[PDB]
Design a protein around this ligand. Sequence first.
Ligand SMILES: CC1=C(/C=C/C(C)=C\C=C\C(C)=C\C=C\C=C(C)\C=C\C=C(C)\C=C\C2=C(C)CCCC2(C)C)C(C)(C)CCC1
Ligand code: SF4
Lengths: 141, 729, 31, 739, 80, 80, 69
Amino acid sequence: MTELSGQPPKFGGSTGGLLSKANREEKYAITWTSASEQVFEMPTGGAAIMNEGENLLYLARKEQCLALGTQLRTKFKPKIQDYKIYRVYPSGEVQYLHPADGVFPEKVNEGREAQGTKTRRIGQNPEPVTIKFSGKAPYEV
Amino acid sequence: TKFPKFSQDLAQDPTTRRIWYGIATAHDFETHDGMTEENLYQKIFASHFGHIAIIFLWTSGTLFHVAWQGNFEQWIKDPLNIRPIAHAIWDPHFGEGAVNAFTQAGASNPVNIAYSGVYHWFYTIGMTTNQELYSGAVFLLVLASLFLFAGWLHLQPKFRPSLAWFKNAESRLNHHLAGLFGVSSLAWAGHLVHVAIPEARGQHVGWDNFLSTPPHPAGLMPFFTGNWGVYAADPDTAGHIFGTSEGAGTAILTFLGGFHPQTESLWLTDIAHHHLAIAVIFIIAGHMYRTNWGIGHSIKEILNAHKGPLTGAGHTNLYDTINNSLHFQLGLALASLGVITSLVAQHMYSLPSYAFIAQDHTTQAALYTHHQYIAGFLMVGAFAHGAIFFVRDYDPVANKDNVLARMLEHKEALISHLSWVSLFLGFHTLGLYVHNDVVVAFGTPEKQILIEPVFAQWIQATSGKALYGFDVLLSNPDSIASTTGAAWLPGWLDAINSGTNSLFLTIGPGDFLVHHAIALGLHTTALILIKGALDARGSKLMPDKKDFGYSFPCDGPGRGGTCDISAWDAFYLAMFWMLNTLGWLTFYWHWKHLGVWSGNVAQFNENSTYLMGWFRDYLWANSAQLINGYNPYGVNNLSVWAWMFLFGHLVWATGFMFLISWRGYWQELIETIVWAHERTPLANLVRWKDKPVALSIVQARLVGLAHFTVGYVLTYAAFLIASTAGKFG
Amino acid sequence: MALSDTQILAALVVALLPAFLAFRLSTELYK
Amino acid sequence: KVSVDNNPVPTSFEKWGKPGHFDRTLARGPKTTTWIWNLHANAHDFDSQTSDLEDVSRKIFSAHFGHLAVVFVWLSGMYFHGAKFSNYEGWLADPTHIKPSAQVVWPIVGQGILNGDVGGGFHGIQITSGLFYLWRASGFTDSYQLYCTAIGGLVMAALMLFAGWFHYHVKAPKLEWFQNVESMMNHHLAGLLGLGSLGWAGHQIHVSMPINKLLDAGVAPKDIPLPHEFILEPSKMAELYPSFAQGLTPFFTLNWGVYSDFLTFKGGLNPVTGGLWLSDTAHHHLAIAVLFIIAGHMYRTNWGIGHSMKEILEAHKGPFTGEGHKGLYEILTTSWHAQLAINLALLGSLTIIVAQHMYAMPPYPYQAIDYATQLSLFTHHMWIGGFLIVGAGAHGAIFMVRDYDPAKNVNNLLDRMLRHRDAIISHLNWVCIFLGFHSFGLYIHNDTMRALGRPQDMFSDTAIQLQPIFAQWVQHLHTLAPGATAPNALATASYAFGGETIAVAGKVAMMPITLGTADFMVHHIHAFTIHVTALILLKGVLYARSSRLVPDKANLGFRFPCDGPGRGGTCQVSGWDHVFLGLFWMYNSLSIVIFHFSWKMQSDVWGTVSPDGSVTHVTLGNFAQSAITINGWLRDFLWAQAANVINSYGSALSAYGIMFLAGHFVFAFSLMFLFSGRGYWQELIESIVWAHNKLNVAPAIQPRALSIIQGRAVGVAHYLLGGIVTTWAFFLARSLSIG
Amino acid sequence: SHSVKIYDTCIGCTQCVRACPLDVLEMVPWDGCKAAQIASSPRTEDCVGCKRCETACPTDFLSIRVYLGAETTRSMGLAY
Amino acid sequence: LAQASPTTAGWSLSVGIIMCLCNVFAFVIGYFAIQKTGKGKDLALPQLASKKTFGLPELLATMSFGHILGAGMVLGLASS
Amino acid sequence: ALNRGDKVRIKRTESYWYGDVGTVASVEKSGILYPVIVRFDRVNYNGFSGSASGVNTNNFAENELELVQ
Ligand SMILES: CC1=C(/C=C/C(C)=C\C=C\C(C)=C\C=C\C=C(C)\C=C\C=C(C)\C=C\C2=C(C)CCCC2(C)C)C(C)(C)CCC1
Ligand code: SF4
């Protein structure tokens, strides 16, 4: 949370990456620890070279960061499970995203509430004329 | 707030789809937030008054144009061999060749020949001068201003009507049957009695003499006491000449029938007597229900007491649905308007009621296909709004075991059997045509299949025709219905058996085949709209159609693929079928009347059985005078129609744009273009305030369909007007 | 027969007022 | 260095039962009707079924052998059709008077009307492929020889089938024989491209020269006997051309001057027959034979001398390029798809070259007599080229999806491509906008000006001229060239560049083609359409792996419809749909080029020539005034030339009109597939299923809808076929009745 | 935001959380199934509507449903 | 006509000063063109001073090149 | 309530498999929401675009099925 320790990967730079929204509204970042030096592909186009130790890389959307993360899971023979996702604001604040608890959402850990979990079947949705001329919708209620 | 203001859901994003959808949903008042019955009905009433204002101002504008820049009185001097004028042309880009090719009909400025056919209307009502047309224009203008002022007046807080006033159905029906349809027809009947009949016979009626001159030598008391035959004493004979008095009696009400022997028109006495009789019948019909007196009927009692043994619950509790669902009654109203406009179109060519309208073929053809396209549009919209009613306003608990519940139960068999009728009819129509095609391709027309439409000649003969010789029940004097002694028999029997009018044309096998093609288009389009409506609340692919709304893009690549699943997409595939069925109708009508007007009916009687003459005799040969609107030598008056023809062709392909290619590729392209705008020097000093993006799937589909429609109608209108004007100028 | 310039100006000055009161209607119907 | 294996997969009959055993999920059976389309879809995609290159490459080899077998069956059938059931001798006795024919029709349902009077005492249907001119140039004069060719081709097609069965089922080579691409290149430049050139050089020297040299004089075809008694008897060569009597001694002593009697550099055309000089083609084939035999000694295979591809690809690297072409050899000797894209692209462009050299320099005798064979041959070769080049784009895209490895291409050229793909698409969009506004805008302006009838500010010869000075300058240079810069060419390279009118018996063959402003605007239209097609296929290749709309789309595959209605909508993001629209753009561009070809050479170079020196075109020279606009394009080319199509009925050409109407029907039926989606008709099919369940005649295999990509495929197929068949009907119907 | 709702007919196959590439679903304990695990969506304001979730689950008219509502350029999927 | 007129082999000048020195130059090139010579199937066992020293395929390659280069010499030299 | 091997008919009306019969597979412990796992012979719509096969097994409860045998 303090600072993003690492190094930009050995790359020749790409013109298909960050845009003015990166310095204007928000932009993304991802860090990981590499067991050994090898080569990967960066989701905005091209192949980059990671280095052993901490690596720092910046992106602009969540799709790119999670595609890269799934690549570092399911491409390399020594599996990497040490990638964290960060978002930075131009005001200088940083925020952690995932995994917030520290374990993947594929499995189950305690200390968690369940929300958006309605206890009714498909046909037990309220029929729309009882919601007619109200601010809500049948899917919300 | 930021535009659009009426929904915070559309004011939360910087994308340009916000702008597109803010243009898109400005009339969907139900989707608006903070929305009740009171606000909705008040905006309804305001928008209705605004539309009536648009109607009357449009009529005032066209009337002012035909008054000022037209050639009305020089057409009064001779009404047959002079083309009318719509308005002059103000365009600085005209070279002198086009100026010489457009300044015609005795004018000094370049003008356009009017094909709207309002000249015959203003003649047959009797607007003999331009000053009177100016008075009419200013009168409808101040009437439109009156509706504007009333529309603003009713939206004050003190004059906003209550919910129950809009709810009171019985008073609305009694008023609209009596005080809208009856007394207006009485007024128009009086207008024909006291203005149109004397101006037709020649004697002048001004704005200071009508209170003095009587419309009949006898008074009102023969109408009162015992003898209405005084008004049916001296009709205008067959030797009558319009605008003068030789062979002209002074009867106002008679029903001799037939046509006008001079100009092939309906007698104005027939129209006046007819309007008066319809006025009587609607004034009687306007007193059905109880309003405030206790005498009459109630909608709820009649609609609930009609039960059934095997119907189910009959029609119970429907009144609560139709009165509390605007979409249902809107669909009924639009369906009634569509069928009545189809009847307008298909009755105006056969039994016209205007002087010299049977000669100017361009106006007749244009007006027929005008009202026919209007019919198609309005009543496919009726079907679409019925589908929207099923989406949004159906009540399962209020309509338990209702007739609509039975409809949703047997919708499967209904859709299946629309499909069966469509396939049977289409297979045999196409098979008959292609067998005729292959047979005449080898030079042996004796093996063609020419099915005589026996029922068509049967109804022709029982309606009065004696050419086919079936002589059943009307033309034979031996039947009991011939010696009825009615006053329409000689005029009608003259009208049917005279080979110079378009009424009850001679029918051949090509008419049988093309009528089967029309019935095919009908049944296909009906299948499309019915399965779009009846399956809008359930499908084994997606029974959650009521949850998502009415117009949604898809439901994803899962479950095998869900593209084009909404009822909006059913309308999307419906519109092409509507346009095609209208097209088949209009090609058949135009080719048949070209054959009749040319006098060479044999080419239609022989070449219509096989596609060759459709594609060659009509679609190829009649296009020759179209395209020569500008030869490399010079131009003529048909330049604008040909250039608009090519214009509509380009519109058709430029909508076939959106009708082929979908979103994601276009999104990648426009995103790369955004990157181009980003890194370039001397162009970062200005940045957009609204984010650019590709159109949505539903919006792209809509704009492709709209382009298809406008290009289609533009090309057909241009070809029809130009070819009909070229052949019979 | 002949037209007059005063007729065209009279039509224009009677047609001005539906435009003004329709502007007022569009102003009031924005809410 | 060969390495083979014995009996890798033995023959059986049981695998033909239970079809679909190649895949793992298609073998359960017909549980739904989509399984049939899945079976037909992946029946040739052998790459994704197995893993290693070994067995799949054996399958490819056997598949090539099957393809050579089937094309050999087709060629043997065509030779037998031309042999027994044709008019080859009756046509060969005369020249321009009698139209040739190579097909008869059974009179069954009135088809004898189609079997019209072709001329020369026969009733049938007219040929237009041009095989008669080929057989006259080769030296065919008897039906028994053609029957021998047919039976030999059929039996060696059976030989090819046996060879394929052997090479897959008995002896299959390893990988190690395949990557030896140096031996591939050396043998293909040496053996295939060289021995055929030498063989046809011998055929033209020995057979074509005396046959045509006596046939142009006026000798009847049944007077002279066969070429074998020529090759036995050298005195006929000696009495015809005295250079044969000197023997092969001047060849070996390099005194080739005496050989110029029959090995010439005449150039131009043949005024007797309208084709090219056969001596010129013999000299051509010998020269290209020498060139290819020299070219087949580039590469190192087993004896030290030559070159290696790895070294030469490492040897090139630039200051602006980086490390250079390292890595191309692995990805281009490992993935079949990259090489397929290369060969398909160059084959498509080569076919375009073939047609563009056929039309202006007719190589075969009597080709320029009838315009139907010329026009039809040109447009057919162009359509083949368009199909092949779009397929090359498709397979380059699928290579970038499937077989590309990001690890072995660090800082490579493909890395730079995927690095500035956004820039390449950007600047190609800008040139697309440029040629769109500045070429079609001229036509819109010209049509608007002609709509006002003011030609003083038009774009024409009689108005503001956009004169193609470069093409006219190169034409003038080609006219001046054979006198000054080509000393050993007495005539010109062609009269199509410019020169004097060359006529033939009765008709005209080729005149110089003047280039006005209309051709300038047309060439700009061409460059614009080619740029659009290049844009869409180039993006479909480059954006096929990753993009910042969806980054993980390569994990899905190559053939996927969409990624849901999210992100605003992701319909047609994959490269398959890029190809699906590229087919439409190919269709549009080639329709324009063949319309311009037909109208320009119907207006300027063809017609009837009078003996006094004047010519008379069929359209009387309207291209300089009616092709400048677009409404004139609609009337003077489409309406004017459709009359021969739509007035041929009851005559001998009713079939062309029937195909014309059927092609319009197929085009209209394609809109089925293009416009609507899937769920609408899957719902409709389900209602039909309920109806059939009511009768208890429900099918065991459950009926389902076509998939979205399947619907797009069938749609572009029907649209494209409808366009091709109606264009074919119009072209043959117009250009056959010209006479 | 693209609202996502999950109903009470979940088995617990955990393909539902496995397929979504935006890390919005999460798998929470429960007691009404054999797996004793129902899925949930605690971060709904960053799923874009890709609807791969609706393809993932093999139950008949699957427990999870996504709905397209008020959109934001955060959830519209742009790089600018 | 004016074609490039060739002559027969005079066998005194046309073969000696033209292509024999060209074969000599081909041997000179073969001294400084082939990076790797001696691994052919036959190694050309009878070595010599400077003529048959490296190997068979180098010898045939340089002799074929001498032939083609001398043919070019005698054709492009005689009568321009 | 139902045992293994029962040929049972379903009446949910919100499923594709309405008006169908088939064999129940297994019943798990009491207190669970949907105990009755049924096996059919047809297939529903499940799968990606152009998928080879969907699913044929789903679990329901007692209060919407009807035993026939
Ligand atoms: C979508 C929907 C819907 C629908 C609508 C519609 C569209 C309707 C219609 C309909 C129609 C469209 C109708 C029509 C009709 C007519 C008829 C049915 C008729 C008849 C018959 C008869 C009986 C006749 C008689 C006669 C004769 C015999 C001849 C002469 C004349 C007379 C009259 C005499 C609704 C909204 C409701 C609801 C929801 C869904
Ligand atoms: S909703 Fe379906 S896919 Fe998601 S966890 Fe539950 S059973 Fe699995």
